[PDB]
Amino acid sequence: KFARRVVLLSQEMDAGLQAWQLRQQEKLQEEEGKQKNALKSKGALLQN
Amino acid sequence: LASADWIAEPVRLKLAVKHKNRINRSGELILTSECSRYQFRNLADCLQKLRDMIAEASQPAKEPSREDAELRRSRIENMNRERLRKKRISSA
Amino acid sequence: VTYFSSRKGKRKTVKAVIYRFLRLHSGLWLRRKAGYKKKLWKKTAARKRRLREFVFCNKTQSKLLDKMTTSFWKRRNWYADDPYQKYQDRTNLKV
Amino acid sequence: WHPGAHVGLGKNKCLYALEEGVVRYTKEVYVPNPSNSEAVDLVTRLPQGAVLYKTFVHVVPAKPEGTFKLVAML
Amino acid sequence: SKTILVKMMSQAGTGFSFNTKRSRLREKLTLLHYDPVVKKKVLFVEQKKIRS
Amino acid sequence: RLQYLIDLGRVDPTQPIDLTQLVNGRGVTIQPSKRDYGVQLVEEGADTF
Amino acid sequence: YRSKPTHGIGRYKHLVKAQEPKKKKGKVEVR
Amino acid sequence: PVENEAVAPEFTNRNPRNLELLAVARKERGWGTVWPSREFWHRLRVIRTQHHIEALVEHRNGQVVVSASTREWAIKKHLYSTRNVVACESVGRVLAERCLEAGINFMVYHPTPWEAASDSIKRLQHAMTEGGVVLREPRRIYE
Amino acid sequence: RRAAPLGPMPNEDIDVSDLERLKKYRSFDRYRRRAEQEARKPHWWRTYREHFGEESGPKDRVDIGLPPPKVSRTQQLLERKQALRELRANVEEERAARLQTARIPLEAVRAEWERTCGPYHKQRLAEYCGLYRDLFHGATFVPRVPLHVAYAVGEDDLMPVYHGNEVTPTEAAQAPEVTYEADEGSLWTLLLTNLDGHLLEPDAEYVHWLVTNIPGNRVTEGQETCPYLPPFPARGSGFHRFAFLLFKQDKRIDFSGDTRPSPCYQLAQRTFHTFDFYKKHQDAMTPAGLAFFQCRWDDSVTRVFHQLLDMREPVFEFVRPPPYHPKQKRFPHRQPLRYLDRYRDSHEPTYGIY
RNA sequence: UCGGAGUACAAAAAACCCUCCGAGUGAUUUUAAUCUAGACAAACCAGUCAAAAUAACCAUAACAUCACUUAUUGAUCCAAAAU
Ligand SMILES: [K+]
Ligand SMILES: [Mg+2]
Ligand SMILES: [Mg+2]
Ligand SMILES: [Mg+2]
Numbered sequence A: 001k002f003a004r005r006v007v008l009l010s011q012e013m014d015a016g017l018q019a020w021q022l023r024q025q026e027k028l029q030e031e032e033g034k035q036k037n038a039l040k041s042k043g044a045l046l047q048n
Numbered sequence B: 001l002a003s004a005d006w007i008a009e010p011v012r013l014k015l016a017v018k019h020k021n022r023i024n025r026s027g028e029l030i031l032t033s034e035c036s037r038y039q040f041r042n043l044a045d046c047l048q049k050l051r052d053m054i055a056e057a058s059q060p061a062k063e064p065s066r067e068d069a070e071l072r073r074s075r076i077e078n079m080n081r082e083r084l085r086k087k088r089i090s091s092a
Numbered sequence C: 001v002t003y004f005s006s007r008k009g010k011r012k013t014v015k016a017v018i019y020r021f022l023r024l025h026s027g028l029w030l031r032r033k034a035g036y037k038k039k040l041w042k043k044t045a046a047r048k049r050r051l052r053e054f055v056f057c058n059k060t061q062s063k064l065l066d067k068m069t070t071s072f073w074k075r076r077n078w079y080a081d082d083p084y085q086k087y088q089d090r091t092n093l094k095v
Numbered sequence D: 001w002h003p004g005a006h007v008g009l010g011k012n013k014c015l016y017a018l019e020e021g022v023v024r025y026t027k028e029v030y031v032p033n034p035s036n037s038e039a040v041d042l043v044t045r046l047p048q049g050a051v052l053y054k055t056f057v058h059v060v061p062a063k064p065e066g067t068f069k070l071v072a073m074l
Numbered sequence E: 001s002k003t004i005l006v007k008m009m010s011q012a013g014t015g016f017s018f019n020t021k022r023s024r025l026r027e028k029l030t031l032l033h034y035d036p037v038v039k040k041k042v043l044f045v046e047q048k049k050i051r052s
Numbered sequence F: 001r002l003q004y005l006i007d008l009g010r011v012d013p014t015q016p017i018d019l020t021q022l023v024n025g026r027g028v029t030i031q032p033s034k035r036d037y038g039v040q041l042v043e044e045g046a047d048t049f
Numbered sequence G: 001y002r003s004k005p006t007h008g009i010g011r012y013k014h015l016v017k018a019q020e021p022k023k024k025k026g027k028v029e030v031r
Numbered sequence H: 001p002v003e004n005e006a007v008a009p010e011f012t013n014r015n016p017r018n019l020e021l022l023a024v025a026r027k028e029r030g031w032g033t034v035w036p037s038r039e040f041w042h043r044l045r046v047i048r049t050q051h052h053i054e055a056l057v058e059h060r061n062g063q064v065v066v067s068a069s070t071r072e073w074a075i076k077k078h079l080y081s082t083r084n085v086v087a088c089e090s091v092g093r094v095l096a097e098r099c100l101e102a103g104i105n106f107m108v109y110h111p112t113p114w115e116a117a118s119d120s121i122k123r124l125q126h127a128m129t130e131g132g133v134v135l136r137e138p139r140r141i142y143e
Numbered sequence I: 001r002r003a004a005p006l007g008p009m010p011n012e013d014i015d016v017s018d019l020e021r022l023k024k025y026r027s028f029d030r031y032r033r034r035a036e037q038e039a040r041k042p043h044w045w046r047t048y049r050e051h052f053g054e055e056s057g058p059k060d061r062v063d064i065g066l067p068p069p070k071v072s073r074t075q076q077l078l079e080r081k082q083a084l085r086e087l088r089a090n091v092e093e094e095r096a097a098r099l100q101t102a103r104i105p106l107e108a109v110r111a112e113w114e115r116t117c118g119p120y121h122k123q124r125l126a127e128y129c130g131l132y133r134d135l136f137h138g139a140t141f142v143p144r145v146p147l148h149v150a151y152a153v154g155e156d157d158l159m160p161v162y163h164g165n166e167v168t169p170t171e172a173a174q175a176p177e178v179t180y181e182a183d184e185g186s187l188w189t190l191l192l193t194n195l196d197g198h199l200l201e202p203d204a205e206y207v208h209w210l211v212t213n214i215p216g217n218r219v220t221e222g223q224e225t226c227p228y229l230p231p232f233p234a235r236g237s238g239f240h241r242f243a244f245l246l247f248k249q250d251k252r253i254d255f256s257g258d259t260r261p262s263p264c265y266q267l268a269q270r271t272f273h274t275f276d277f278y279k280k281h282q283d284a285m286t287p288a289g290l291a292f293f294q295c296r297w298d299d300s301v302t303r304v305f306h307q308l309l310d311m312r313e314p315v316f317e318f319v320r321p322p323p324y325h326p327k328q329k330r331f332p333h334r335q336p337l338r339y340l341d342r343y344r345d346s347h348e349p350t351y352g353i354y
Numbered sequence J: 001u002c003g004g005a006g007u008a009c010a011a012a013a014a015a016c017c018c019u020c021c022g023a024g025u026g027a028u029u030u031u032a033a034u035c036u037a038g039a040c041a042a043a044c045c046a047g048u049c050a051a052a053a054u055a056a057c058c059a060u061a062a063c064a065u066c067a068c069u070u071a072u073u074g075a076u077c078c079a080a081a082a083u
């Protein structure tokens, strides 16, 4: 019973660490999506 | 409403003018009640409501008026939109 | 409270409770606020309104009054034109 | 604590929420009512570089005012 | 100085009385209360003395 | 309940129905001592009567 | 609150003077 | 059946002014210990600097919707001076026209007690009343 | 356990000592101006603007529009001052100004306001009503060119359409006319859309008018893509916003993929997405003008559903959330007799075995 | 018996024949309504606030004020008065 607890605890910590890494990549990939989804700013650049 | 021959011709047309919100596309006047749980009372309410609609429309002299809180702002928003309408130039 | 009377041997009731309480069939008891007729000019408008309202009694008071009255007053009554007739039964009580 | 947005004030200086929502506490500036002679006098004597700050209690509404639903399709 | 408690009856004819504390040295008091019976403000005058 | 009694044969519409027939049909119980003056008709099942 | 970093944000009594009220018995032009 | 008859049970309206124009939106009731009261949909803000007269109409979010001030070149070249009683009248009339153009017909103005008796402000509101803009916003329905 | 503040305190700049030297406010109107200027700064502590929806605070607005006209400030500064001095020296103006008897040519101010600061004032009007949010999302444009839309209602009466106005559908039954100053060297595109009013989809907008490749001022001579359709707001949900969009295009663009049938009455074919539409032809077109109005329900809407759209008229209603009540206790304590009525399901009495 | 400050230093509560101030009502008019969501407080009895809605009056008007404002007060039964 003690051995199974060690395996269970080791996997949950490892699995939890993987989830945080996925969220960090997801947040960065979402940020570049907004940059590559807006419109080409004409603005004052038309006369520039 | 058009083929309802138990009401007079002036009364029939006045119902359409006042209650045009309840008139279906095919000319079917629709009245609905939801007060009581027993369907006998619900039907009785509809008939009594129908009597009041006909009774007030039947009388030519029956033309009551009232002033409401929403009427005051309705008149103002109607008056304000007439300020811009006053210009009279050749249109399209 | 006389648990056993000396004439018939049944359980008597306290006449003080019935003269100033109303029992609904759901077990709830009804009473008037204390001091609703004393010194009305002194109290504010809100305070007078609060004192003129019927109130319910908590579990201990409700349980206390059930042991002070016999079983005649806990019966189901169908009065004619009773204002409290619609409050007799509880409804939509999820305990 | 002074009342803020969506928070009333009783005659006994108690704060009660007016709309269903989340209670929030905030430090804001204080601009007293001109009809309050004592409060406006305190503001008058303040130096030019200072502003009064007071704590406030807010209730950000959660439920919307209402929604539109189809009741009849004539 | 002691005050007097007097009962004021409506002058609108309806039966409505509310007690008001009044100073003893003052003469008969006359106010403008609001009786719910008529749902309108009506004149009220002092009628009887109840408590000192 | 009045419809329920008739369907099960507790009372019969062929014979006139009064208070006595209801008691013999075990429909309602009347206690004269407890200040009961009879039976009042309510409209709980007017839709399916 | 004391422990919060925003403590004392409402301090004002050190901005205005004390402004000693002219007491009935202590009314004197102490110059 | 008819492909054109498909209607969603719930209709979502994204117009921010829809609730305000129906007098059903929430007014930020409260405060009371501060001034001015922030229980409004639109507030008229009049600022009298020593050189220019500026009048603002603000939403409760802090944004300014329509503004008419003597600092504009359009109004400056038609006024003799920007700090007169006549200048306030011009500001009031110009803002009154723009509010009608912007659809804002109701606003709340809470003047300072001494400004309420001031000659310029007294006649400034007279221009607004005759300009079509009406103060005293309608009461909220089911407040 | 005292903690260190995260930044400068509000009133720590002034010196506590030597109060008499510091000049006071002496007025109440000075404090309000000072307080309001202080209330808009981004303080490090919690503020009212933080919790009550300041719309993400500072936003990097993307500008997609015509560049502002090139104006020389040096020349403008001298000519503006020179014009004022001539008006200043007029004695008759001083006579009227002192006696509080003078008026201004409001029509002249209207013409100059449109040219000078009209584009900027209309920009915040669109932002306040959220036109940019529902059309270009975060992007915004300045209405550089003036635009006029008017409806022919009577024999000669003319209902105008300004920014944020209110127009009854009866006035909008007929097609409007658009007048704007432009030389015969470029092309323009006109688009009228119903931002709110789509039935099945809440994020889509209808199209009521679309004219492609307008030669200069004459709108009629331009190629027509989508025929005009009178507004049809629902009876329940009122005050739908209709926006006129003017696009300036360099080259003749092939607007054939968005072509609609001439007797187009299928609302499924009127589904439109301005951001998607502008995405395809971003290189060619460029927004230049804007004019939008509010529109509620009227009697003329009814015939649109029946005769034109061949649709049963839908009616909505404003429904409020049900009132909240606490969980019912078996023995209510010190509660009024009406405590049971709150949790009653129906007022009709219900009998059981009886 | 009732209120305020310290003891009780920062949510609440917290004692002594403990240390110090008070209350057992006046002045004035703005004479302050009816009805109900939701809560603080509390052994109980009591005490407190209160949106919406209706009426009153600027014709879309409810906090009586001031005196440290906080205390200025008494349950049933019973008796008297118009009910
Ligand atoms: K919509
Ligand atoms: Mg029985
Ligand atoms: Mg509690
Ligand atoms: Mg109210």
Ligand SMILES: [Mg+2]
Pocket: J076, J077
């Ligand atoms: Mg006794």
